[PDB]
Amino acid sequence: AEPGIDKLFGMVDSKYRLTVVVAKRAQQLLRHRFKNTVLEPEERPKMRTLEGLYDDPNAVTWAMKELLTGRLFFGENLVPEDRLQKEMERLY
Amino acid sequence: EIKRFGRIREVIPLPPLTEIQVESYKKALQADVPPEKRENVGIQAAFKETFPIEEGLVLDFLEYRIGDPPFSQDECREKDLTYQAPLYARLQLIHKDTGLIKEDEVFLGHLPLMTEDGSFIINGADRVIVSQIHRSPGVYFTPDPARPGRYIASIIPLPKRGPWIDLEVEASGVVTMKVNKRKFPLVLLLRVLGYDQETLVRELSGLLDEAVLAMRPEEAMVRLFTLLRPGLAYLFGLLADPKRYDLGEAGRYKAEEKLGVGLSGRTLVFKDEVFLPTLRYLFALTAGVPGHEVDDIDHLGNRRIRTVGELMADQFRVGLARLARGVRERMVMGSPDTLTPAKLVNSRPLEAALREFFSRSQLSQFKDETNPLSSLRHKRRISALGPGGLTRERAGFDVRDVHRTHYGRICPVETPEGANIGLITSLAAYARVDALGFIRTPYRRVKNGVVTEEVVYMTASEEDRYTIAQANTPLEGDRIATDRVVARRRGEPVIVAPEEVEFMDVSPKQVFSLNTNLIPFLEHDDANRALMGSNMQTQAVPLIRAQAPVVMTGLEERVVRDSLAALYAEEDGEVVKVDGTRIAVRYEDGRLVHPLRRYARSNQGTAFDQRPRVRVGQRVDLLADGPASEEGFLALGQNVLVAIMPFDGYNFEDAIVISEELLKRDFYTSIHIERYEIEARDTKLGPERITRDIPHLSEAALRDLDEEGIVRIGAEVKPGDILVGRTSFKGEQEPSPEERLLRSIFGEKARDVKDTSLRVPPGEGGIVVGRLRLRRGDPGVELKPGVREVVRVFVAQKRKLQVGDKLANRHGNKGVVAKILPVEDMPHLPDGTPVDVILNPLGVPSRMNLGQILETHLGLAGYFLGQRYISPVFDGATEPEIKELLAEAFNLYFGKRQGEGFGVDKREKEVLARAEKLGLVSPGKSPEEQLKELFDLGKVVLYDGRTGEPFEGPIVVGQMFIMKLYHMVEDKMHARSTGPYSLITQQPLGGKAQFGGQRFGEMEVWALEAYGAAHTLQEMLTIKSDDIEGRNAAYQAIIKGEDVPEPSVPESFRVLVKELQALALDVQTLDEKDNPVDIFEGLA
Amino acid sequence: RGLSFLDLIQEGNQGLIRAVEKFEYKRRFKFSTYATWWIRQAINRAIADQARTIRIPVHMVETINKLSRTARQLQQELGREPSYEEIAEAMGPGWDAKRVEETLKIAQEP
DNA sequence: AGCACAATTTAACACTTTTGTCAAGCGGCC
DNA sequence: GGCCGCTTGACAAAAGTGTTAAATTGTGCTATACT
Secondary structure: OOOOOHHHHHHOOOHHHHHHHHHHHHHHHHHOOOOOOOOOOOOOOOEEOOOOEEOOOOOHHHHHHHOOOOOOOOOOOOOOOOOHHHHHHOOO | OOOEOOOOOOOOOOOOOOHHHHOOOOOOOOOOOOOOOOOOOOHHHHHHHOOOOOOOOEEEEEOOOOOOOOOOOOOHHHHOOOOEOOEOOEEEEEOOOOOOEEOOOOOOEOOEOOOOOOOOOOOOOOOOOOOEOEEOOEOOOOOOOOOOOOOEOOEOOOOOOOOOEEEEOOOOOOOEEEEOOOOEEHHHHHHHOOOOOOOOOOOOOOOHHHHHHOOOHHHHHHHHHHHOOOOOOOOOOOOOOOOOOOOOOOOOOOOOOOOOOOOOOOOOOOOOOOOOHHHHHHHOOOOOOOOOOOOOOOOOOOEEOOOHHHHHHHHHHHHHHHHHHHHHHHHHOOOOOOOOOOOOOOOOHHHHHHHHHHHOOOOOOOOOOOOHHHHHOHHHHOEOOOOOOOOOOOOOOOOOOOOOOOOOOOOOOOOOOOOOOOOEOOOEOOOOOOOOOOOOOOOEEOOOOOEEOOOOOOOOOOOEOOOOOOOOOOOOOOOEEOOOOOOOOEOOOOOOOOOOOOOOOOOHHHOOEOOOOOOOOOOOOOHHHHHHHHHHOOOOOOOOOOOOOOOOOOOOOOOOOOOOOOOOOOOOOOOOOOOOOEEOOOOOOOOOOEEOOOOOOOOOOOOOOOOOOOOOOOOOOOOOOOOOEEOOEEOOOEOOEEEOOOOOOOOOOOOEEEEOHHHHOOOOOOEOOEEOOEEEOEOOOOEEEEOOOOOOOOOHHHHHHOOOOOOOOOOOEOOOOOOOOEEEOOOOOOOOOOHHHHHHHOOOOOOOOOOOOOOOOOOOOEOEEEOOOOOOOOOOOOOOOOOEEEEOOEEOOEOOOOOEOOOOOOOOOOOOEEEEEOOOOOOOEOOEOOOOEEOOOOOOOOOOOOOOHHHHOOHHHHHHOOOOOEOOOOOOOOHHHHHHHHHHHHHHHHHHHHHHOOOOOOHHHHOHHHHHHHOOOOOOOOHHHHHHHHHHOOOOOOOOOOOOOOOOOOOOEEEOOEOOOOOOOHHHOOOOOOOOOOOOOOOOOOOOOOOOOOOOOHHHHHHHHHOOOOHHHHHOOOOOOOOHHHHHHHHHHHHHOOOOOOOOOOOHHHHHHHHHHHOOOOOOOOOOOOOOOOOOOOOO | OOOOHHHHHHHHHHHHHHHOOOOOOOOOOOOOOOHHHHHHHHHHHHHOOOOOOOOOOOOOHHHHHHHHHHHHHHHOOOOOOOOOHHHOOOOOOOOOOHHHHHHHHHOOOO
């Protein structure tokens, strides 16, 4: 399963609304700007293979953990879908 | 090692087993027989049936000639041509004034014959046909399934040879006559029979209720022709073509023993024939003494097995039919120009139409040459599907009670599979003899030296199955009898007489098929269970090893010679064999060298070999084995020590465990071959030619193993390499703009032929055995017009044994190789010999119970005692028989230990504490005996090489039989990306490099959408597959950067809108605004 | 050959439209079994025009059937199916093995 | 089974001309 | 004086227009046999 997946259902009123948030975030968490993660300290999701410790290229996992730090927000908010580019603009 | 367990082996099994084929080209094909004699049946049969073609001008048919075929054997399995021998008869048109123009045997055309092997060679594919079955002619009436009203359903001579006659009795116009497709009163036509009144009523018999239809002869002919067809009689019994129960049996010998005395062969010839005896046996049938209302009931006594002999006789006729029609047209036009019995007859209609039958007709399935037993199961396979109306798989009106079992012990009950049950079975070993040409005939012993063949319909003084005998007069007192259905206790005439007219089965092999009797202990499993195992012997993929299964019936003694898998020895002996690839000669009569098949070639990619076994001189009469055999002993799979037990889970459900021991000795290994073919087309625009200097392909990988074009023989090649680099001037894509740069930048120039080569397919890591250049300029090669240079190479490859594959012995227990742990682990016997294979239960043991374990117990027993027992089906080899054997095996086993310098082990002592309370071994003397009885019905303690401590509990061990099916893993796997494509179809299919493919079952999409998957579901039709212009988006994106795929643009939908646009229908992309009426299709 | 019975009717009866027209009422033969020909000739001129091929004039159908009758002529006088080059001698000048193969390459009904 | 005539039409190939590319010469700059 | 760059001349290779040679249709029509 997923580390604390059941805890993800409790928050979202629907199991389907959760998925959307998971990806919606991953879209602007690694692809948009890898420096948009709230989890930066020692809570930063990392892998440990033969080489060493590095951040997993997959961001879908970060969302599940990112939507557990109590931060972020979901639901009908900010009608301008073109404003997301403005906020992302400040993040280079 | 001969431990025969067979009792009273009277007459041997009906040889040569393959008699259906012999009685096919010896009963019908009266070629190798002087025209002076011979009746019909076959050529001369359908030949004479062809009435003297009218127009004097009348062509007469006489004599015939076959033999001296163009290309002999091997020359066909290499060039493709078939073994079609020329056949032609002597003709001579005749007309009023002197017109006895007889041609020189009138060279007609070709005709494929049969080989001693018992098969045919079609397009170098050497295929075989399968005789069908159908209710023989005659009146069976058939009980009305709907409402109580026994009607009539007269069976025609052949499905495709006559209007089906019938007689139903309803309300409106009771007793209505209907043949082929008619709806008229029986009286209306009964009149035409010369009988209208006074002679048909009271004399023999709602009948003449229509007196107005039984008065005038001619009128009946006019009224009838008005009821059938729109607003005919020339057939239906009249003349020989639509209705004619010729031959002399089946159709003929029926009413003579059913309806009444008297018969000409065909109904209503208009003199009635079957229209009188019918109502005579009908009116007397309804509420009468003479019952016999016995319907078809799948009674084999009525089931006709039309062999190939008559199977071709009809098709041949049908083909010869056009010839007669063609001659007529030739007689209607012209007179002096060109009219000779050789010009009016062309070798195209009676040929092409006769050849398309062996190349395309279902029955002519690709001769399964996987193994000897597979090729022999075709001539006996038999079916009901084909040109007849007993086809249609899955459904077909009402066939539920048509494929089910039947009271016919002349056919097995475990040959079918699934998709087609009852339609595909097999013939018995002691079946098909004497005049099998008509109806089947089994064997019956009279308790005295003699065997009669009174057909299957036998019912004289019941009978008894081979069970308990005592010098002709079994002192049983209760002779197990079996008459018709149930078996009334017994009979025992209580006399020194022969028997109960036929109370003797001779051998228990008469029940099951010669394929099922092979099974060792065939008497401890279910039908379905034994079914799968029986089919495993059809794809057991031969092996050079062939250790031969310990327990094997003495029936395989003929499966090696009859199948001609191996060779033979004529007359005397004195071999002085030189061996190698060409067996020497024998001092019997002359000097004839026996050349091996040289690995030959298989139709399933197996390639069988035949290693000899002799030197200096010897005779008796085996001589060199075959594919999967050993000393005249049929050895399909391979027997190896196994042990039933679970191991970490590497055998869940019904999986199988394998050790590295097998691989170290390459115990389980096979061979797979594949023929390639690269034709050099001539599109005129640019002819193709094979060269060794392919453009842009300028590299070493070529000149090294290519040269002159074709690859060198005996050169190991892997996938992704060249084999037949042909050059084509075909210029489809001219030079591209910015491409002209990268072409000039380097040291090379342009091109005008492109690479375009063969390129090894996704799987081929072996070596080439030999090539073959077959280009034009040679009149001895029938190739496609306009084609030049037809390269044909043979690539081999060793199989070894990876992971997976199906074992499945000879009982049903099938599985798959999970993991092959190298020696180290695996249960180590208390004397070495680590368990090579582990067979944990689950799957078939408890559920679909069977009897394979009875082999294990007698396996290790024959290992130590050094013997290979023989267990005949339904005879000998029982639980108590294992007791006596186990005793000797134990003392011999423990004997070594007890004398080696030890005896009884601690770890071997605690295990007894188990059985003790477990109720297994009885408490008493020292562990010596406790370990003895534990061996009789079980095995030694056994340990575990991985963990460290022995498996607490009595585990069984012994040698059984571990086979290997054709289905593997390598050639059963696939993988691809965007590489695949099939323009016009808008889906991944085809490819000159990769023939990838994958389907998304309909029952799969619904499940995918059942979840929250909406983007993943759409994706399956977003970028990939559908959207061709979208397939790039994704694949082009990821390769460049992240980014999210397109919104989706269906491709087939555009084709659907188009295909559906072929008509008025206007699939408009109505937008949510309505008035705008959005439309996406304008080339964007 | 080509076109169903129903179709053949068209090109056939149509041959009357131009046949019955050009009728030499002069000769004392009386019209009868004449158009019987103006139909078949229209048929042969049709079966060559219409077929499951592409474009077969009067210089191909006549050759195909010629190479056909020949292939069936030598066949009835040999015992085996004659090759392509072995048919050259059966024809005459210009007909070798290549062009003879080009005729059976295009089509006729395949 | 089809041949011709004519007529006319279709198809392609070759020429002389033109265009493009390469090498040589001249001029300018260092 | 030397070297490099640019421009022009010569040579070689491949097109637009002309020229002619090969194929289809129609029709003609043929043609022969039967009514």
